[PDB]
Motif scaffolding. Structure first.
Motif, PDB file in Angstrom:
ATOM      1  N   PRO F  36       0.800  -1.277   0.000  1.00 26.74           N
ATOM      2  CA  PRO F  36       0.000   0.000   0.000  1.00 26.74           C
ATOM      3  C   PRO F  36       0.842   1.345   0.000  1.00 26.74           C
ATOM      4  O   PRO F  36       0.383   2.335  -0.530  1.00 26.74           O
ATOM      5  CB  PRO F  36      -0.859  -0.086   1.288  1.00 26.74           C
ATOM      6  CG  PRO F  36      -1.103  -1.585   1.404  1.00 26.74           C
ATOM      7  CD  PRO F  36       0.305  -2.246   1.038  1.00 26.74           C
ATOM      8  N   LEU F  37       1.773   1.299   1.210  1.00 29.45           N
ATOM      9  CA  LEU F  37       2.542   2.544   1.369  1.00 29.45           C
ATOM     10  C   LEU F  37       3.355   2.852   0.101  1.00 29.45           C
ATOM     11  O   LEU F  37       3.643   4.023  -0.199  1.00 29.45           O
ATOM     12  CB  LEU F  37       3.448   2.508   2.610  1.00 29.45           C
ATOM     13  CG  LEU F  37       3.984   3.855   3.148  1.00 29.45           C
ATOM     14  CD1 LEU F  37       2.878   4.886   3.455  1.00 29.45           C
ATOM     15  CD2 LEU F  37       4.839   3.637   4.380  1.00 29.45           C
ATOM     16  N   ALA F  38       3.698   1.797  -0.647  1.00 26.25           N
ATOM     17  CA  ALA F  38       4.479   1.923  -1.879  1.00 26.25           C
ATOM     18  C   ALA F  38       3.648   2.640  -2.937  1.00 26.25           C
ATOM     19  O   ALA F  38       4.140   3.545  -3.618  1.00 26.25           O
ATOM     20  CB  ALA F  38       4.928   0.545  -2.379  1.00 26.25           C
ATOM     21  N   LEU F  39       2.382   2.236  -3.043  1.00 27.33           N
ATOM     22  CA  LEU F  39       1.447   2.765  -4.029  1.00 27.33           C
ATOM     23  C   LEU F  39       1.118   4.228  -3.756  1.00 27.33           C
ATOM     24  O   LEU F  39       0.983   5.017  -4.691  1.00 27.33           O
ATOM     25  CB  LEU F  39       0.174   1.921  -4.057  1.00 27.33           C
ATOM     26  CG  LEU F  39      -0.766   2.064  -5.260  1.00 27.33           C
ATOM     27  CD1 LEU F  39      -0.311   1.211  -6.452  1.00 27.33           C
ATOM     28  CD2 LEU F  39      -2.197   1.702  -4.859  1.00 27.33           C
ATOM     29  N   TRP F  40       1.001   4.589  -2.478  1.00 29.19           N
ATOM     30  CA  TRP F  40       0.834   5.989  -2.087  1.00 29.19           C
ATOM     31  C   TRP F  40       2.018   6.848  -2.542  1.00 29.19           C
ATOM     32  O   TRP F  40       1.826   7.894  -3.171  1.00 29.19           O
ATOM     33  CB  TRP F  40       0.652   6.132  -0.573  1.00 29.19           C
ATOM     34  CG  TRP F  40       0.246   7.528  -0.165  1.00 29.19           C
ATOM     35  CD1 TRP F  40      -1.016   8.055  -0.196  1.00 29.19           C
ATOM     36  CD2 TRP F  40       1.103   8.577   0.314  1.00 29.19           C
ATOM     37  NE1 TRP F  40      -1.002   9.364   0.238  1.00 29.19           N
ATOM     38  CE2 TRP F  40       0.284   9.709   0.560  1.00 29.19           C
ATOM     39  CE3 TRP F  40       2.481   8.674   0.558  1.00 29.19           C
ATOM     40  CZ2 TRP F  40       0.801  10.922   1.042  1.00 29.19           C
ATOM     41  CZ3 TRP F  40       2.992   9.882   1.037  1.00 29.19           C
ATOM     42  CH2 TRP F  40       2.151  10.988   1.276  1.00 29.19           C
ATOM     43  N   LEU F  41       3.232   6.396  -2.219  1.00 31.73           N
ATOM     44  CA  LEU F  41       4.462   7.131  -2.538  1.00 31.73           C
ATOM     45  C   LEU F  41       4.738   7.234  -4.038  1.00 31.73           C
ATOM     46  O   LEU F  41       5.308   8.227  -4.488  1.00 31.73           O
ATOM     47  CB  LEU F  41       5.672   6.528  -1.818  1.00 31.73           C
ATOM     48  CG  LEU F  41       6.908   7.421  -1.637  1.00 31.73           C
ATOM     49  CD1 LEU F  41       6.566   8.744  -0.925  1.00 31.73           C
ATOM     50  CD2 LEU F  41       8.034   6.681  -0.896  1.00 31.73           C
ATOM     51  N   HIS F  42       4.343   6.210  -4.792  1.00 29.87           N
ATOM     52  CA  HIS F  42       4.590   6.170  -6.222  1.00 29.87           C
ATOM     53  C   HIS F  42       3.685   7.176  -6.938  1.00 29.87           C
ATOM     54  O   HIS F  42       4.112   7.835  -7.884  1.00 29.87           O
ATOM     55  CB  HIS F  42       4.423   4.745  -6.767  1.00 29.87           C
ATOM     56  CG  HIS F  42       4.312   4.670  -8.262  1.00 29.87           C
ATOM     57  ND1 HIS F  42       5.413   4.638  -9.090  1.00 29.87           N
ATOM     58  CD2 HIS F  42       3.228   4.627  -9.075  1.00 29.87           C
ATOM     59  CE1 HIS F  42       5.012   4.579 -10.350  1.00 29.87           C
ATOM     60  NE2 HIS F  42       3.693   4.571 -10.367  1.00 29.87           N
ATOM     61  N   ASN F  43       2.447   7.299  -6.463  1.00 31.83           N
ATOM     62  CA  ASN F  43       1.495   8.249  -7.014  1.00 31.83           C
ATOM     63  C   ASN F  43       1.697   9.670  -6.485  1.00 31.83           C
ATOM     64  O   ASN F  43       1.497  10.640  -7.219  1.00 31.83           O
ATOM     65  CB  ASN F  43       0.052   7.760  -6.800  1.00 31.83           C
ATOM     66  CG  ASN F  43      -0.198   6.388  -7.421  1.00 31.83           C
ATOM     67  OD1 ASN F  43       0.709   5.563  -7.535  1.00 31.83           O
ATOM     68  ND2 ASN F  43      -1.434   6.144  -7.818  1.00 31.83           N
ATOM     69  N   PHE F  44       2.094   9.789  -5.221  1.00 32.33           N
ATOM     70  CA  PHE F  44       2.450  11.081  -4.624  1.00 32.33           C
ATOM     71  C   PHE F  44       3.629  11.734  -5.358  1.00 32.33           C
ATOM     72  O   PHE F  44       3.615  12.947  -5.629  1.00 32.33           O
ATOM     73  CB  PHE F  44       2.772  10.905  -3.127  1.00 32.33           C
ATOM     74  CG  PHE F  44       3.258  12.161  -2.442  1.00 32.33           C
ATOM     75  CD1 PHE F  44       2.353  13.090  -1.935  1.00 32.33           C
ATOM     76  CD2 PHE F  44       4.618  12.401  -2.277  1.00 32.33           C
ATOM     77  CE1 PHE F  44       2.802  14.253  -1.290  1.00 32.33           C
ATOM     78  CE2 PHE F  44       5.076  13.556  -1.632  1.00 32.33           C
ATOM     79  CZ  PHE F  44       4.168  14.480  -1.138  1.00 32.33           C
ATOM     80  N   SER F  45       4.626  10.911  -5.697  1.00 35.41           N
ATOM     81  CA  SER F  45       5.907  11.381  -6.244  1.00 35.41           C
ATOM     82  C   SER F  45       5.945  11.633  -7.767  1.00 35.41           C
ATOM     83  O   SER F  45       6.784  12.410  -8.237  1.00 35.41           O
ATOM     84  CB  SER F  45       7.028  10.418  -5.837  1.00 35.41           C
ATOM     85  N   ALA F  46       5.063  10.982  -8.528  1.00 37.55           N
ATOM     86  CA  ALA F  46       5.028  11.149  -9.982  1.00 37.55           C
ATOM     87  C   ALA F  46       4.869  12.620 -10.355  1.00 37.55           C
ATOM     88  O   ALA F  46       3.826  13.222 -10.098  1.00 37.55           O
ATOM     89  CB  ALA F  46       3.905  10.313 -10.603  1.00 37.55           C
TER      90      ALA F  46
END
Lengths: 105, 467, 467, 105, 105, 105, 118
Positions: F36-46
């Motif tokens: 999950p936390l990975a998916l948050w950070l990947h979309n936050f950072s794009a």
């Protein structure tokens, strides 16, 4: 013209002239900082400077402190001046030669 | 007693290396960075520097015994290797107060840097810092006015002041000089200035420039309702000419003149600084030639020593560098000597190059002047670095404004007033400077044109790395 | 015509690099040695130096078009790589006569070395030589007297003159100062001198020294029947003090004073040189601080430029170095700038560091003064190198004579007179100097004692290689 | 450490030793080539080998041609060997010191 | 933390930033010496500087003179500054990190 | 060549790219550890990856702990790789140029 | 030669003639003339090589009683600062008052370079 032998012998003479010149330096240093020890070193050194390695070894028995000082100074002198000696000796010989032909021939 | 005269050469370190010496508060201290020649020990080299900058020479002289050498000799009391560098040391040397002529920077320098830099036994020598004892500092006049008295005279409060060197450096007639000055000043700059090499020349004699520039100052001040000034260069071939030029500036009622303290010299400068005090004229100091002396870190004198010397000799402004402009200036170093020229007490801090704690015993500070290769995009950084008590100068950055001089002047005047307003409102000039400038650029086309021109390499590169 | 104003930054080399320019005889030429920063081409770096030392700044300004830039701009007309050295070049730059204030060394230096040494785009910069055009040379007074008028005033012909700095540098009272002076002069020296840092200090105020020294000169001159002098140091904090001190020397009827031209400055020096001419006082110039500027060959100003500047500003003597003594001096270089300070016409000769042919249009020469760490054994070399028109000075080499001052003085006085006699007889001082000294040592015990003391490392090693 | 004086003194000592080396060469050549002339030069030179430039001007006064032979050879040796001397003396000194600091220190 | 890959990729990014900065330099040089060619280069370069090798190769076809100029400037820049980047990046990160914790945490 | 400006600009670009590299590391770690936390950070950072210090202060406002994770990693990478970058970029540039001067010139 | 005068101008006129006559030494009443005139004279003496003897006329109006006034040792310190080559110190044994212990104290204050509290 045995070049390996001539270079070898020239190098040993150089090494032992630089030792003598390191001596002059520390003698002068000591003349300022420790006059009685300067006198000791001068009197000790008189007629000992022909062979620089023999000289340092003789000095080690009496004053290992001073021996180590000279060792460092000769090392330092060489590191500062050695690289400029080839030009100075080659162009000095060439100019000295050519001055002798101009005076006489 | 007088310990017997023995003629002959001794090591300097026998007399002048005193590692157990604790400096008095009346001692002048010097920090030298040196590299000895191969075969010369560091303590002998340090002692030689102490000797030949105070009382000593190469051989023992009997005359020493007529006086008290212990009272007078320079004392190398500390040596330390420069971390990370082969054959480089700092020597710290203490000089008795008695060695120096009161009120004479010329004499101080003659001892400390007179002969020792050319010594065969030393490869390179650089004077890093001098601690001037308070008892010596008090023998000097210092700045004719200094920062707070200058703000009070000029009614200039609340932000950096703005200046501008007229260009081309040389070649303009007196009338065209005053023209450029009028147009700059009317646009919002507080000051304009002669170039350092504008003195008196075939294309423009000094007395004509003074005349036409005074007219430009009056017209622009009348139009703007703000005090205007132009640093009229009195740098001259002789003391007599220097004074003749200073005198006419006073006659014209000019508030400020300038002097190249290094190319003219400290003796002429100290004369001028005293005259300025007696005649109520502000003195801007140009550091022409300093980089001949202070640029390389292995040999010379660091600028922070020259800055200290100038504050003693006398000057109301002194160029400090920009850090970001066309000429060199290390930031940490600059923050250090800006403190040395402004503040009353500066703690030792080697990270900013301040080797000694310096007190000034309420001698006025000197305004730092940031000048050289700077434009509008530099403004927030300059305000951040120097703060309010500074003069920021834009020569090419005013006269080089795509539409010409008058719009160029307005661009600079608007940019300045926008920054002063913002500062006064509590905005952080360092963090918000670019924004403050963009804002003003929105309603000032001529500022916008300037911001565009000198914005400058951007970078910008790139994202791929997609899943 | 005025070719349109296009605002913005251009390369300097578009305006200031002019490889097809042929210098006029009225042009001031400068030779700089520089290393550009990585990425800065040599011709742009050379052009930047030419630009920012004449007419140019970092961006295009419209005011150029009000005047004739072609007439006024500095012109980098030649660049050449320094043979055998990576990233090092010589730039030769021509400056129009119009750029310079007549009779002002201060102004000349302000342009040529004012700002360019600190340019970010340049790593290091060293001014090697300046050709002063004859039309500019004629705007200067030059030496108050010069070599031939000085010999005529002092009745000193046929050999080098001899001097001596009193030691210790600092610490002696006025009375003890005059004592040392009397004993030196009575022994055969022509001159004694204040140390460069002897000005006016708590242990010895200047007016007292002037008084006691004048007494010493009268007594020694009366005893010896030869003209005696002592360079009284008028180096002071201000122009006013400098003049006050020069004035008293004249009042005392003193033939010669000295001035530290670099630590006091060219503006004060030029004032003093004019006064000396009007008042018939000889002017000895000490080069204190020069090595801060001229020692390293990658950055600074070479001494031969400073020597040229001093001859223009004014001085009767100037220290030239010894080559063989305690301070650095390259022989080839020294022979070069000794010619520059003495002769009327000096041909370009890069082997002696003379980049340009220099004419002086009958401006008097300056006496070179060899001083620093020299003793009797150096005498034949000194006479060989400098010839008759020089002053050779022995401070420690007089006052350091094993038996004390009076025998030390006699040693120097005998050594000098022996050399002058020998020279006049046709003996070669260079080849025969040691012998002339040994001869005199035979009948002078005090000279013999000195020769022994300072003889100095000998070497001597060895033969084996027998058949 | 008056470094240019030391270097100047060192070069003149190298020049004198290389003149002695050249004199040894010329002597060995004349050993094959001209045994009389060899015997003259060997006896002429014994003790004269002190200063190389003084020796040369003195040999020029007696036999200008033979002086020229020594002049050429001293110079030939110098051109061949001088460039190797810096590295030999510097590492020579460092090695000789390194030995003694090892046993003593 | 694939260090060989990260370094490789950081180096390529560096190389291609130094190329971009060499561009800025010659652009500025040309602004002084050849204004029309500066304009050509600026217009040509717009949106081409992501990959420094691709950029130089595109420039070779049109203006081999300029390509070679940039190649030299990037080489010179690197030789002057590369050695100081490790400290600047390490201590910059450490100071930037620690400034972010002081502002917030 | 305003060399300290170029170096200053270069270091800030290296710091931003190393922050992007650290963000890639932390992201791959959370790929194993916390999807999950990975998916948050990947979309936050794009798209946010522009300025590394601005990205960090903005991530601190949302999740102070994860910003700290990226802070540590960027710094760990820098300490491990930065010292190799000078030699890589200098020889990289020299090699890339050497190729092109060979074919073209 | 006493150059004590009504005005600065007269004082200087008198000092000037003494110099013209080649006189080695003049005197000045520093308290009745005042410190401003005295400091002027002391500077002139330095520039003109004339010795300056200082008379303390009026000091006892100020320094005699120990309950009120200024002790002489303060006046002596002030005079050394203003400038004087001689200064009257009292005799202890003569016709005018001088406490011995006190006198030894301020004689040290006017002669020496460093005087410990005592």
């Amino acid at each position: 013209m045995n070049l390996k032998q001539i270079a070898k012998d020239t190098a040993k003479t150089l090494q032992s002239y630089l030792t003598y010149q390191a001596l002059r330096t520390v003698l002068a240093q000591l003349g300022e900082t420790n006059p009685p020890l300067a006198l000791w070193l001068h009197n000790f050194s008189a007629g000992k400077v022909q062979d620089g390695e023999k000289y340092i070894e003789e000095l080690f028995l009496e004053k290992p402190d001073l021996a180590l000082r000279i060792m460092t100074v000769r090392e330092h002198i060489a590191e500062e001046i050695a690289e400029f000696l080839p030009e100075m000796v080659v162009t000095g010989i060439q100019q000295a030669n050519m001055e002798k032909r101009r005076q006489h021939l | 007693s007088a310990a017997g005269y023995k003629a002959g050469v001794k090591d300097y370190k026998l007399t002048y290396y005193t590692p157990d010496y604790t400096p008095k508060d009346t001692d002048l201290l010097a920090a030298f960075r040196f590299s000895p020649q191969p075969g010369v020990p560091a303590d002998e080299a340090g002692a030689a520097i102490a000797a030949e900058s105070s009382t000593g020479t190469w051989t023992t002289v009997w005359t020493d015994l007529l006086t008290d050498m212990d009272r007078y000799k320079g004392k190398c009391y500390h040596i330390e290797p420069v971390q990370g560098e082969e054959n480089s040391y700092f020597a710290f040397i203490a000089y008795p107060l008695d060695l120096f002529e009161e009120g004479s920077v010329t004499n101080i320098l003659t001892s400390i840097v007179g002969n020792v830099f050319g010594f065969k036994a030393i490869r390179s020598l650089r004077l890093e810092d001098i601690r001037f004892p308070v008892a010596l500092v008090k023998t000097f006049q210092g700045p004719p006015h200094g920062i707070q008295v200058e703000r009070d005279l000029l009614n200039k409060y609340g932000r950096p002041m703005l200046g501008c060197t007229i260009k081309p450096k040389l070649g303009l007639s007196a009338k065209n000089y005053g023209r450029a000055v009028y147009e700059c000043l009317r646009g919002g700059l507080d000051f304009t200035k002669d170039d350092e090499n504008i003195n008196s020349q075939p294309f423009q004699r000094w007395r004509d420039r003074f005349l036409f520039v005074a007219d430009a100052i009056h017209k622009s001040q009348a139009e703007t309702g703000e005090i205007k000034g132009h640093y009229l260069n009195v740098t001259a071939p002789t003391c007599e000419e220097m004074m003749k030029r200073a005198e006419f500036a006073k006659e014209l009622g000019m508030p400020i003149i300038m002097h190249d303290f290094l190319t003219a010299g400290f003796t002429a400068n100290t004369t001028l600084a005293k005259w300025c005090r007696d005649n109520g004229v502000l003195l801007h100091i140009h550091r022409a030639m300093h980089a001949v002396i202070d640029r390389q870190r292995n040999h010379g004198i660091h600028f922070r020593v020259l800055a200290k010397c100038l504050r003693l000799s006398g000057g109301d402004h002194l160029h400090s560098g920009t850090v970001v402009g066309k000429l060199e200036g290390d930031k940490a170093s600059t923050l250090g000597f800006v403190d040395l020229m402004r503040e009353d007490h500066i703690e030792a801090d080697r990270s900013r190059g301040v080797f000694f704690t310096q007190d000034w015993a309420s001698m006025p500070g000197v305004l730092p002047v940031a000048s050289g290769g700077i434009h509008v995009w530099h403004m927030p950084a300059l305000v951040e670095i120097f703060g309010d008590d500074s003069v920021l100068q834009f020569g090419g950055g005013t006269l080089g404004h795509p539409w010409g001089n008058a719009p160029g002047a307005t661009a600079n005047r608007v940019a300045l007033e926008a920054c002063v307003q913002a500062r006064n409102e509590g905005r952080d000039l360092y963090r918000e400077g670019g924004d403050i400038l963009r804002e003003a650029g929105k309603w000032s086309p001529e500022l916008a044109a300037a911001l565009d021109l000198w914005k400058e390499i951007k970078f910008e590169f790139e994202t791929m790395d997609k899943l």
